[PDB]
Amino acid sequence: AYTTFSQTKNDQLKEPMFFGQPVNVARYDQQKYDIFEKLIEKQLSFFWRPEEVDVSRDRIDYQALPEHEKHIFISNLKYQTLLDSIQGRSPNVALLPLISIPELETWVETWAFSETIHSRSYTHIIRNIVNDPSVVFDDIVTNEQIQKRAEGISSYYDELIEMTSYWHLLGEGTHTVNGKTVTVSLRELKKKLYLCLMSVNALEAIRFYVSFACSFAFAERELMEGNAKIIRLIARDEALHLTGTQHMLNLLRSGADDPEMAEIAEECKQECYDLFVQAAQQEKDWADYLFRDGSMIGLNKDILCQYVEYITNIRMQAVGLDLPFQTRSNPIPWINTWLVS
Amino acid sequence: AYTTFSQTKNDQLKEPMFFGQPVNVARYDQQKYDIFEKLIEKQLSFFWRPEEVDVSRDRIDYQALPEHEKHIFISNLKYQTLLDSIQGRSPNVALLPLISIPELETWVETWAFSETIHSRSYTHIIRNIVNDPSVVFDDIVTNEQIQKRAEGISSYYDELIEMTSYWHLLGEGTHTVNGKTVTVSLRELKKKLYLCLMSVNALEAIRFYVSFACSFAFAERELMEGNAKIIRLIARDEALHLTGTQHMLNLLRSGADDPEMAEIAEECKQECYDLFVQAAQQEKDWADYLFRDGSMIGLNKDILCQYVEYITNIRMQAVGLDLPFQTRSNPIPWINTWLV
Ligand SMILES: [Hg+2]
Ligand SMILES: [Hg+2]
Ligand SMILES: [Hg+2]
Ligand SMILES: [Hg+2]
Ligand SMILES: [Hg+2]
Ligand SMILES: [Hg+2]
Ligand SMILES: [Hg+2]
Ligand SMILES: [Hg+2]
Ligand SMILES: [Hg+2]
Ligand SMILES: [Hg+2]
Ligand SMILES: [Hg+2]
Ligand SMILES: [Hg+2]
Ligand SMILES: [Hg+2]
Ligand SMILES: [Mn+2]
Ligand SMILES: [Mn+2]
Ligand SMILES: [Mn+2]
Ligand SMILES: [Mn+2]
């Protein structure tokens, strides 16, 4: 029931962000929510090319690293690579079929495109630091600890996509498919979208930021500086991406965009809270493992657990959730040097 | 049965372009087909921002045009806006879910993104040459002649998306859905994808080029030069887009990718031919509306018809199809100045 060009003339300023009439004309002279047009403009202004960053000294730095620090560095880079592989395709496959205002549709396609640049930059780094990149890329898919740390991200997107297909094909109701009852509920689909957007917010606003702490701890020691320059550009984009999901989530919960969505958000406040705490716990578990063969220099599992708690509290407060952790000031203020946002 | 991160460690150099295992890791150190990596690199090198193009003199030029020339200019621009609105979202909703090699997945997302830039450029032109952009944008949706010229584009993509959802949800076989028998055939889905790609090839290689000729006819008169700079940048991107679809199609026909696709391309060759003939006739039919209020020196229905036949023959030959039209030299050689 989805269409690439809805033939009904509609007022795009009055449609909800999601589940309304599919967007027909792509226009940018007006918007329901100007934050999305501002984000498109900023992201276009930040366009960068990975190939332009010099990573020629990173190979020697990496080879000089102690084995446990090589492990920390490459494990962290593999996780960044996994997250951006998912983020280049997923916002497009999962959200585009559900968006009903043009500025949000183009923001999603712009956001997803920017993630493909991030994926291209990891290839540029990897190719310049190991003789055979396949060694690194082939360990991402079945790497035990990576799977563990990112567990559940692909499932939230996959479940939302499956439910969306059933809704577009069959519509609301109680259906049968090959002898089994299949219930399609718009309310349940709205809940799946909300929890998925909350997960994306945790992904870009907490999972990536923990990864930036690792990358920039090397930059502080003047090591892996090509990687550092790339991660700096990636973090500048991720700040926009987190800004977009925070606004989506706050507009949905306030009730100003879709009243039903506001009721749904309040109804799963406890679920949302526990999923954020679970994301935090997975990052802690990763840090504990990664810093087992030996803590790095300027970073260790305890400093990293503290940073995870610090940033989780900030991000949860930004979308109206209670704080799960003791409040403290930033345990690694030096990181602000690198987060030019 | 679609997944955003397939858990099987697979050799991406051995998957088919479409219908294999969904791509898991996005890597660019190797490619089954380097042409798509080259296309990503070239499109990225062409990155441009519409708003930076100076269109301040176009408002003066546009208001100075006789009424019928305003009609020709704006009718063409509304069609370009329709096509790019569809092309910004459609490759991502219709093709992305079926791609199984990383270089083609990223090419498709890069290509779709580049179309959103084209749409943004039309907003930049429109808001700067007319007082109420809404009248222009709303007319795109409701305009009977515009929709007539584009008929079949959205429908093809929509049918492909529907069939794809049934395949991902139910898998191959004959099913019972709410008491109706629903057949999901992967071979039929491959045919739908294949013909959708041929239709996209016609869209970027013919329909957009006829629109470029209309735009540039004003630039030849030394008017609407801001629009001309933008259309020049857009045409440079479209050349890459049609290169992409010609290569997808010709690789599928070669038998070097999925062998079933090579069988399909041969078996469905009359349908390929027919959809090009139909698109050409739609572009010709549009002339009656375009020139309803009068034509222009060097731009009228006859000239448009000749150009449609000329470019259609060129594009059909490029993907191995017989030529429907009498061969002719280019009726508007002045367009080469603008296309580079
Ligand atoms: Hg999501
Ligand atoms: Hg999600
Ligand atoms: Hg880390
Ligand atoms: Hg580190
Ligand atoms: Hg929730
Ligand atoms: Hg919530
Ligand atoms: Hg949550
Ligand atoms: Hg912690
Ligand atoms: Hg297509
Ligand atoms: Hg198509
Ligand atoms: Hg023309
Ligand atoms: Hg064919
Ligand atoms: Hg003709
Ligand atoms: Mn990213
Ligand atoms: Mn991101
Ligand atoms: Mn275009
Ligand atoms: Mn195009």
UniProtKB/Swiss-Prot annotation, chain A:
The active site is at residue 122. Induction: Induced 4.2-fold by hydroxyurea (at protein level). This is Ribonucleoside-diphosphate reductase 1 subunit beta. Fe cation 1 binds at residues 84, 115, 118. It comes from the Bacteria. Fe cation 2 binds at residues 115, 204, 238, 241. E.coli produces two separate class I enzymes. This one is the functional enzyme during growth. The keyword Metal-binding applies. Coiled coil: none annotated. NCBIfam families: PRK09101.1 (NF006576). Its cofactor is Fe cation. It comes from Escherichia coli (strain K12). Binds 2 iron ions per subunit.
